[PDB]
């Protein structure tokens, strides 16, 4: 196996397992593990309730590697064109996840790695200012966690 990250990776493996076992018993390993869990759960609930929003994204958007970036950016710019709330942020994550899954379904696998970067850039550049002003991710966990 790969030697170059063994020390850190083995640490992350232990943390991941213990985070999971603690969560299963109603506990949280850390603030960040709790943000991650709340976002996974909110995304599950959003996709459960609004499933038809996500149907046939790649054919409706005519997604190709050459057009994916502009299509992604146009959707997110319209989503937030007139402001931000936590519910719209959940929609943003759920949209990116659906686009990744359906890009893989449609044999455009290279798009997963790019969407993830496009999502992180938009989060850091355009959503983080609002998030800081509105209580940080801890307030999202307060409002949306269990």
């Amino acid at each position: 196996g790969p030697l170059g990250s063994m020390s850190q990776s083995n640490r992350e493996l232990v943390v991941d397992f213990l985070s999971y076992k603690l969560s299963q018993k109603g506990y949280s390993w850390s603030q960040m593990a709790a943000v991650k869990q709340a976002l996974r759960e909110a995304g599950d609930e959003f996709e459960l309730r609004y499933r038809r929003a996500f149907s046939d994204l790649t054919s409706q958007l005519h997604i190709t590697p050459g057009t994916a970036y502009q299509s992604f950016e146009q959707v997110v710019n319209e989503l937030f064109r007139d402001g931000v709330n936590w519910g719209r942020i959940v929609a943003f994550f759920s949209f990116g996840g659906a686009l990744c899954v359906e890009s893989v379904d449609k044999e455009m696998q290279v798009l997963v790695s790019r969407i993830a970067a496009w999502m992180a850039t938009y989060l850091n550049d355009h959503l983080e200012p609002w998030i800081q002003e509105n209580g940080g991710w801890d307030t999202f966990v307060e409002l949306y966690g269990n």
Partner: peptide
């Protein structure tokens, strides 16, 4: 247009979602 169509649905659904749990 398709970008705007889906984004407006996401926006309307996101606000409704936002309204329920918080």
């Amino acid at each position: 247009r398709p970008e705007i169509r889906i984004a407006q649905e996401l926006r309307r659904x996101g606000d409704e979602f936002n309204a329920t749990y918080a």
